[PDB]
Design a protein around this ligand. Sequence first.
Ligand SMILES: *[C@@H]1O[C@H](CO)[C@@H](O[C@@H]2O[C@H](CO)[C@@H](O[C@@H]3O[C@H](CO[C@H]4O[C@H](CO)[C@@H](O)[C@H](O)[C@@H]4O)[C@@H](O)[C@H](O[C@H]4O[C@H](CO)[C@@H](O)[C@H](O)[C@@H]4O)[C@@H]3O)[C@H](O)[C@H]2NC(C)=O)[C@H](O)[C@H]1NC(C)=O
Ligand SMILES: CC(=O)N[C@@H]1[C@@H](O)[C@H](O[C@@H]2O[C@H](CO)[C@H](O)[C@H](O[C@@H]3O[C@H](CO)[C@@H](O)[C@H](O)[C@H]3NC(C)=O)[C@H]2O)[C@@H](CO)O[C@H]1O
Ligand code: UDP
Ligand code: NAG
Ligand code: CL
Ligand code: CL
Ligand code: MG
Length: 327
Amino acid sequence: PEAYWNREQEKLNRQYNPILSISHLNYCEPDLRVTSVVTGFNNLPDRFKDFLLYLRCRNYSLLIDQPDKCAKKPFLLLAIKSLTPHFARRQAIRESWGQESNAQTVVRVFLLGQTPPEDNHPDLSDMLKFESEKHQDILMWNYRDTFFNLSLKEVLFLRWVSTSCPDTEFVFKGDDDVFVNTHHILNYLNSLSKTKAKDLFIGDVIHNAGPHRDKKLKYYIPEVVYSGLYPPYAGGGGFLYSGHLALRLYHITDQVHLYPIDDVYTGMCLQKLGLVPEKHKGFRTFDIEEKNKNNICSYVDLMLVHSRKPQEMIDIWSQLQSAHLKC
Ligand SMILES: *[C@@H]1O[C@H](CO)[C@@H](O[C@@H]2O[C@H](CO)[C@@H](O[C@@H]3O[C@H](CO[C@H]4O[C@H](CO)[C@@H](O)[C@H](O)[C@@H]4O)[C@@H](O)[C@H](O[C@H]4O[C@H](CO)[C@@H](O)[C@H](O)[C@@H]4O)[C@@H]3O)[C@H](O)[C@H]2NC(C)=O)[C@H](O)[C@H]1NC(C)=O
Ligand SMILES: CC(=O)N[C@@H]1[C@@H](O)[C@H](O[C@@H]2O[C@H](CO)[C@H](O)[C@H](O[C@@H]3O[C@H](CO)[C@@H](O)[C@H](O)[C@H]3NC(C)=O)[C@H]2O)[C@@H](CO)O[C@H]1O
Ligand SMILES: O=c1ccn([C@@H]2O[C@H](COP(=O)(O)OP(=O)(O)O)[C@@H](O)[C@H]2O)c(=O)[nH]1
Ligand SMILES: *[C@@H]1O[C@H](CO)[C@@H](O)[C@H](O)[C@H]1NC(C)=O
Ligand SMILES: [Cl-]
Ligand SMILES: [Cl-]
Ligand SMILES: [Mg+2]
């Protein structure tokens, strides 16, 4: 078409689809041709200019790995998107719904990029090494951890699954400011037939959405960048899928250009597999009703709630342990 991403994506489609008859994965120099191709490139916000220049570079390497995380074969892998300074959020997740267990082994990793000093981030590196050496649940890549780079966090994670955790039955991928009912999730996982557990992918799916064009909102996308409607995509606050689908998802990522909104990007990859994400009412990416926020019995049949502060996650998980004695 005329939107840049839509244009470069069709070029990918013809590369991978014979019926339609520089690298797009390993080119890590600034693609300067975008400056004369995208209308009004110099008047775009810096995140767009960085996203367009390095759209074709995704070969980033792990700086902090936990290679023996899935030694014991996990039933559920919890992968949590996080930023370096979120020490309290990560620690509260460890102490509540993200703790490792066996009961069906559950493993936990936090996904991080770099918060480099050249972006005026405070040097928290030696506190992150301290945190890593003590909890051994930090995965960190050497890319600039930013909002528009989150679909990069998705691809680099799916790569780590295929190379360091391909056996895991299921994967939960979510944010570090949500409460997840890990107990209710595992009971849902064992109330599933092998037929459905094959290509399982559930979340707060959004249908027939389009790019926000409000120049001042977070998910704003210019019309020179993307045109049309998003595919169905689960809310990035947290979705649940099987390891089998994770491997299929990773191998299809090369056929989809990175997109600045990472949960939309996952939907584009699901669409390319011929799959539709499955809505589930337990995923409350928009919280619940304030009158029900007091009641611990309101959290028993939920899958996740967004959003929650660290001490809120701990308070709910604490109360949730005695919920079967009073609900
Ligand atoms: C997602 O994450 C990736 C990975 O971290 C980010 O990619 C990096 O993006 C930064 C820009 O923010 C890149 O750094 C920039 O490189 C430009 C080109 O420099 C190369 O080429 C010149 C010749 O043209 C060589 O001299 C040089 O050795 C480099 O090899 C620079 O022009 C940029 O200049 C910036 O800093 C200097 C010094 O302060 C000043 O001139 C400017 O003020 C300017 O700010 C800058 O250095 C970096 O190369 C990318 N890394 C990789 C591995 O690709 C993405 O930006 C990020 N995406 C989003 C959307 O966040
Ligand atoms: C029919 C329709 O138009 N529905 C709209 C929703 O699509 C829209 O949802 C929000 O959209 C954003 C992109 O436009 C984005 O997907 C957002 O999810 C968040 O996305 C970030 C990355 O962009 C991801 O990292 C994060 O995990 C995720 N957060 C949560 C809690 O899921 C999504 O909410 C909505 C705008 O609020 O409006 C609907 O009308
Ligand atoms: O540069 C970033 C910004 C966000 N996040 C994570 O991505 C999730 C979504 O962040 P945010 O809550 O700000 O987006 P929202 O939920 O409001 O859409 C959160 O868990 C953040 O920790 C990240 O990993 N890197
Ligand atoms: C990606 O690969 C290219 C070519 O092999 C290389 O020049 C570049 O440095 C790589 N990027 C990273 C981050 O290693
Ligand atoms: Cl621990
Ligand atoms: Cl907070
Ligand atoms: Mg959030």
